[PDB]
């Protein structure tokens, strides 16, 4: 019904530091015939579940250094790959991807696996989407781990969540230009630019999912939805502000990648004020946009923070 293609399994043969077994679901309600890939690590009967959401233009591969720290703590870790990324199937038309299409996939996933006692782990698009999930069923969420992200509200209600789009020129403008303009987009070279510490092996793991441009419709669409917020997204993200400010009663841990040009300190401090009970943030000086690349530290510190409250 929704024309999609699937990445040949062979593309993932030689992944570096990725020993996690695949789990798939192809019976989601609303997503008929589309297969979703997710990691389900640690004790599947754990009381605590960490739901790790990725963003643009990555995949679960991005949480590979956090996963084992969470799992060794006794938790069940879930890390899905959004349609269009990693090992999930990729709709071929950029028009199929919308804020709600990915949002609904997430609610569908949570219902299907019946996840409870969730510690939400977000960043980038994983947070734009993820920060709007607790208000739909608050009883299932208990903690939040937030890395560089915010809500895609309208420019007036929150100017900090709009300003980064236009400035600086080497910030979101450069990122977007790099992503939606080349006709021969190489995600390994893009990653090495925006995540300078990656090795060549890690870099290639982010290009693994896309053998050629036909597979990258979802990759091309994310940047454009940041820049051109559809109504439902604005209403949805605006009502979530209300949720974090007055309804949230959970424990929160915030980590900021200080070298980020897009969603750094000028976007994080304002987020921090909006989340009821958010404590002092852990600032990671050598981290860029992809804070997960310095994940072992973030994962340990967060469990250390959450422990000193149990």
From Swiss-Prot:
Keyword Hydrolase attached: yes
Tagged with keyword Hydrolase: yes
AB hydrolase-1 domain span: 49-295
BP terms from Gene Ontology: 1,2-dichloroethane catabolic process; response to toxic substance
Record text on subunit structure and interactions: Monomer.
Biological role: Catalyzes hydrolytic cleavage of carbon-halogen bonds in halogenated aliphatic compounds, leading to the formation of the corresponding primary alcohols, halide ions and protons. Has a broad substrate specificity, which includes terminally mono- and di- chlorinated and brominated alkanes (up to C4 only). The highest activity was found with 1,2-dichloroethane, 1,3-dichloropropane, and 1,2-dibromoethane.
The protein's name in its UniProt record: Haloalkane dehalogenase
Organism of origin: Xanthobacter autotrophicus
Native organism taxonomy: Bacteria, Pseudomonadati, Pseudomonadota, Alphaproteobacteria, Hyphomicrobiales
């Amino acid at each position: 019904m929704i024309n999609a293609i699937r990445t040949p399994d062979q593309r993932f043969s030689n992944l570096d530091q990725y020993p996690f077994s695949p789990n798939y679901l192809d019976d989601l309600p609303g997503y008929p015939g589309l297969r979703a890939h997710y990691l389900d690590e640690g004790n599947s009967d754990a009381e605590d579940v960490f739901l790790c959401l990725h963003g643009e233009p990555t995949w679960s591969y991005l949480y590979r250094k956090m996963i084992p720290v969470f799992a060794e703590s006794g938790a069940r870790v879930i890390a899905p790959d959004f349609f269009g990324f990693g090992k999930s199937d990729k709709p071929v038309d950029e028009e199929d991807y919308t804020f709600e299409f990915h949002r609904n996939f997430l609610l569908a996933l949570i219902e299907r696996l019946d996840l409870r006692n969730i510690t939400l782990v977000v960043q980038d698009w994983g947070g734009f989407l993820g920060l709007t999930l607790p208000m739909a069923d608050p009883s299932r969420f208990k903690r939040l781990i937030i890395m560089n992200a915010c809500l895609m509200t309208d420019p007036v209600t929150q100017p900090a969540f709009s300003a980064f789009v236009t400035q600086p020129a080497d910030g979101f403008t450069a990122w977007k230009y790099d992503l939606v303009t080349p006709s021969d987009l190489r995600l390994d070279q893009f990653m090495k630019r925006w995540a300078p510490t990656l090795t060549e092996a890690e870099a290639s793991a982010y290009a693994a999912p896309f053998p050629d441009t036909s597979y990258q419709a979802g990759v091309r669409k994310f940047p454009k939805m940041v820049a051109q917020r559809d109504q439902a997204c604005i209403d949805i993200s605006t009502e979530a502000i209300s949720f974090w400010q007055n309804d949230w009663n959970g424990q929160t841990f915030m980590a900021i990648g200080m070298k980020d040009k897009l969603l750094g300190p000028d976007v994080m401090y304002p987020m921090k004020a909006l989340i009821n009970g958010c404590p002092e943030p852990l600032e990671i000086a050598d981290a860029g946009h992809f804070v997960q690349e310095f994940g072992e530290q973030v994962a340990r510190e967060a469990l250390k923070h959450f422990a000193e409250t149990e």
